[PDB]
Amino acid sequence: KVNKERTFLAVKPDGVARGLVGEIIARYEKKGFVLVGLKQLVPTKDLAESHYAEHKERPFFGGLVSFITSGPVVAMVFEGKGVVASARLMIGVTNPLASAPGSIRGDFGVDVGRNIIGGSDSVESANREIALWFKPEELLTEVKPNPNLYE
């Protein structure tokens, strides 16, 4: 069902180094989304290249891959109604300087290349990304819907 949609979010090495992990997780918890997967890791080049495959024909791909593998990342899966599009709205837009106050990039970022966090752009991409970053055994099996959040 609709309330069981999931998205993949990565706090990138800049977000981790700046001590923004808890702030970010708290925003998603307060919204009512449920954490169904979480880990810190240093991504491998193989994983990073697959993660960023949509950009592989562009010159900036190499820099995205080098950066995401340059230090720890906090990988997360959140679940809830419309979580893919909502999590993106909560992040802001590609340019942090154009991101509205209240959004994560709007409150915390200034540079496209140090954009703190990325989220899946679609349900199809989210399913692909979740399977890339997490083994099925690392994900919660089932979330009972909170009646205070869902009718």
Curated annotation (Swiss-Prot):
Protein location: Cytoplasm
UniProt enzyme class: transferase
Annotated keywords: ATP-binding, Cytoplasm, Kinase, Magnesium, Metal-binding, Nucleotide metabolism, Nucleotide-binding, Phosphoprotein, Transferase
Magnesium recorded as keyword: yes
Disulphide bonds in the chain: none
Gene Ontology terms for molecular function: ATP binding; metal ion binding; nucleoside diphosphate kinase activity
One Pfam family cited in the UniProt record for this chain: NDK
GO biological process: actin cytoskeleton organization; asexual reproduction; CTP biosynthetic process; dGTP biosynthetic process from dGDP; G protein-coupled receptor signaling pathway; GTP biosynthetic process; negative regulation of exocytosis; negative regulation of phagocytosis
Signal peptide (from-to): none
Binding-site residues for ATP, renumbered to this chain: 12, 60, 88, 94, 105, 115
Cofactor list: Mg(2+)
Any one Gene Ontology cellular component term annotated for this protein: plasma membrane
PROSITE patterns xref list: NDPK, NDPK_LIKE
InterPro entries: NDK-like_dom (IPR034907), NDK-like_dom_sf (IPR036850), Nucleoside_diP_kinase (IPR001564), Nucleoside_diP_kinase_AS (IPR023005)
Active site: 118
EC number: 2.7.4.6
Annotated SMART domains: NDK (SM00562)
Keyword presence, Kinase: yes
Catalytic activity: a 2'-deoxyribonucleoside 5'-diphosphate + ATP = a 2'-deoxyribonucleoside 5'-triphosphate + ADP; a ribonucleoside 5'-diphosphate + ATP = a ribonucleoside 5'-triphosphate + ADP
Known role: Major role in the synthesis of nucleoside triphosphates other than ATP.
Oligomeric and partner information: Homohexamer.
UniProt similarity note: Belongs to the NDK family.
Protein name in UniProt: Nucleoside diphosphate kinase, cytosolic
Gene giving rise to this polypeptide: ndkC-1
